[PDB]
Design a protein around this motif. Sequence first.
Motif, PDB file in Angstrom:
ATOM      1  N   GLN A 100       0.888  -1.140   0.000  1.00 53.53           N
ATOM      2  CA  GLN A 100       0.000   0.000   0.000  1.00 53.53           C
ATOM      3  C   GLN A 100       0.945   1.213   0.000  1.00 53.53           C
ATOM      4  O   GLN A 100       2.099   1.107   0.441  1.00 53.53           O
ATOM      5  N   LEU A 101       0.476   2.350  -0.497  1.00 53.32           N
ATOM      6  CA  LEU A 101       1.313   3.547  -0.507  1.00 53.32           C
ATOM      7  C   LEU A 101       0.583   4.633   0.258  1.00 53.32           C
ATOM      8  O   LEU A 101      -0.594   4.878   0.016  1.00 53.32           O
ATOM      9  N   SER A 102       1.258   5.279   1.200  1.00 50.93           N
ATOM     10  CA  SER A 102       0.603   6.343   1.947  1.00 50.93           C
ATOM     11  C   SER A 102       0.906   7.663   1.269  1.00 50.93           C
ATOM     12  O   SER A 102       2.070   7.987   1.053  1.00 50.93           O
ATOM     13  N   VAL A 103      -0.135   8.427   0.952  1.00 52.83           N
ATOM     14  CA  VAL A 103       0.052   9.691   0.263  1.00 52.83           C
ATOM     15  C   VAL A 103      -0.951  10.759   0.663  1.00 52.83           C
ATOM     16  O   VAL A 103      -2.144  10.494   0.812  1.00 52.83           O
ATOM     17  N   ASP A 104      -0.463  11.981   0.788  1.00 54.99           N
ATOM     18  CA  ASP A 104      -1.275  13.126   1.186  1.00 54.99           C
ATOM     19  C   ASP A 104      -2.438  13.486   0.257  1.00 54.99           C
ATOM     20  O   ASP A 104      -2.316  13.446  -0.968  1.00 54.99           O
ATOM     21  N   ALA A 105      -3.559  13.875   0.855  1.00 53.79           N
ATOM     22  CA  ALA A 105      -4.740  14.256   0.090  1.00 53.79           C
ATOM     23  C   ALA A 105      -4.453  15.502  -0.755  1.00 53.79           C
ATOM     24  O   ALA A 105      -5.117  15.744  -1.764  1.00 53.79           O
ATOM     25  N   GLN A 106      -3.444  16.274  -0.354  1.00 55.66           N
ATOM     26  CA  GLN A 106      -3.079  17.490  -1.074  1.00 55.66           C
ATOM     27  C   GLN A 106      -2.516  17.182  -2.469  1.00 55.66           C
ATOM     28  O   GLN A 106      -2.315  18.086  -3.269  1.00 55.66           O
ATOM     29  N   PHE A 107      -2.247  15.913  -2.744  1.00 56.05           N
ATOM     30  CA  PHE A 107      -1.737  15.482  -4.049  1.00 56.05           C
ATOM     31  C   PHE A 107      -2.853  15.512  -5.084  1.00 56.05           C
ATOM     32  O   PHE A 107      -2.596  15.561  -6.293  1.00 56.05           O
ATOM     33  N   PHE A 108      -4.093  15.460  -4.610  1.00 62.04           N
ATOM     34  CA  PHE A 108      -5.232  15.406  -5.522  1.00 62.04           C
ATOM     35  C   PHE A 108      -6.257  16.502  -5.299  1.00 62.04           C
ATOM     36  O   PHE A 108      -6.838  16.607  -4.227  1.00 62.04           O
ATOM     37  N   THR A 109      -6.493  17.324  -6.314  1.00 61.57           N
ATOM     38  CA  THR A 109      -7.474  18.382  -6.145  1.00 61.57           C
ATOM     39  C   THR A 109      -8.840  17.723  -6.054  1.00 61.57           C
ATOM     40  O   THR A 109      -9.728  18.226  -5.378  1.00 61.57           O
ATOM     41  N   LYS A 110      -8.989  16.583  -6.726  1.00 53.95           N
ATOM     42  CA  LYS A 110     -10.225  15.795  -6.694  1.00 53.95           C
ATOM     43  C   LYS A 110      -9.966  14.587  -5.789  1.00 53.95           C
ATOM     44  O   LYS A 110      -8.920  13.947  -5.880  1.00 53.95           O
TER      45      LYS A 110
END
Lengths: 189, 189
Positions: A100-110
Motif C-alpha cells: 500500500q502507498l501512503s500519500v497526502d490528500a493534497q496530491f489530488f485536487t479531486k
Amino acid sequence: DSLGWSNVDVLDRICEAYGFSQKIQLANHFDIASSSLSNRYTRGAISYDFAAHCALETGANLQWLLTGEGEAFVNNRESSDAKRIEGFTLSEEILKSDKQLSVDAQFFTKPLTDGMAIRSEGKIYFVDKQASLSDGLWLVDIKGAISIRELTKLPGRKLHVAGGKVPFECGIDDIKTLGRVVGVYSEVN
Amino acid sequence: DSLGWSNVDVLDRICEAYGFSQKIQLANHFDIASSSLSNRYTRGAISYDFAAHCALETGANLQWLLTGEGEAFVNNRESSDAKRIEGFTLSEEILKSDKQLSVDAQFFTKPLTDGMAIRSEGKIYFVDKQASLSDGLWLVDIKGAISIRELTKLPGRKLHVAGGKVPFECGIDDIKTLGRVVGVYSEVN
C-alpha cells in the motif's frame, strides 16, 4: 473460538478497512476463485486469514476488524491527510500487487476514492479507476498486456492510442481502460 | 539524574534512528557545530531535546532511544526516509512555510532525513537539504531570490546555473545551495 461472530460482517468490515465497495475487490486480491470466496461468505467460519492480512496490509485495527463499532483508522477521507492507496508494480506489461502507498490528500485536487499507485520505471503513477473516459494518460489492458498510454477520444466512439509502440486507432470496444492517471511522482536520481 | 543512562548511547541510538553513519550528520541535522555535538557526547547530561525530536521525526521508540531497551521501530516508519515533510510554497522568488505533507518513505530510494516539500508552479518538489553538491536540479538562493535551477559543476569550484530566463556561471561561493531536488510530483489535470 466460537464467540458468535459474523463472517459476512468481518468480510465487509474488512472491505471498509481496505476501502472497498465491491466483493471482486477481494477474490483476485488473495488469488482465489470467486467460487472459493462465496464459500467464505456462506460458512460461519471466520476468515481469520483475511482479517490478519488486512490488518497487516492496510494497517487497520484487528480488534475492530473482528468486532468494534468504528475503531479502525480513517479511510473516509484524509485522516490527518494520510490517505492509503493500493499499490502495484508494472513491469514487462504485467501488473503485480505490492505494498500500500501512503500519500497526502493534497496530491489530488479531486478526491481519489478508487485509486491505484503503480510503480513503473522510476515513477509512481496515481490512477483513478473511476475516471470518466477523456483525453489523457491512462492505464489500459490491450489483449492482456497492461500499459500506460495517451488516449485521445475520436468521433464515432473511437480512440487514438499512443505510447510504447507506434500509435494506432481503435474503437472503445477494442481495449479495456482501467483508470486515468491523475498524478505522477518521478524520482530525480 | 536517573543514573545509568548513557548520554553517549542515547546520541548513538538517535543516529541509528535517523540512519546516520557519522556523528557529523547529527550535528548537521540539528544545525549545531561538530564541536558542540562533541560536547554533548562528553557531558554527562542526556540530550532529551534531540531524543524528543528524534522520536517525533522518525517515530522511533522514546524508551528505546533513552535506554536501548526493546527495539527502535516495530513496523511503520521503520527505519523509513520521510513520512511527514515540512511543506512550503515558492512563488515570486519568495519561499514561505506551509502545512506539512504526508508522504510514503517508498517515494525515496535514498533516505530523506532533512527534506522540504515545495509547491511551485503546480508541482511539488521534494528537496534534500543535506545533499552533497553535484550536478542536478537544486533549490538555490541567488542574492536573496529563491528559485529551482539546474546546476552543473565546473572546474575551478564553479557552477553553471540554468533554468531562469538566461544561464550564468559563478563560483560556489557566489550563490547559496539550499538542497537538491530528489523527486517531483505533478497532478495531471
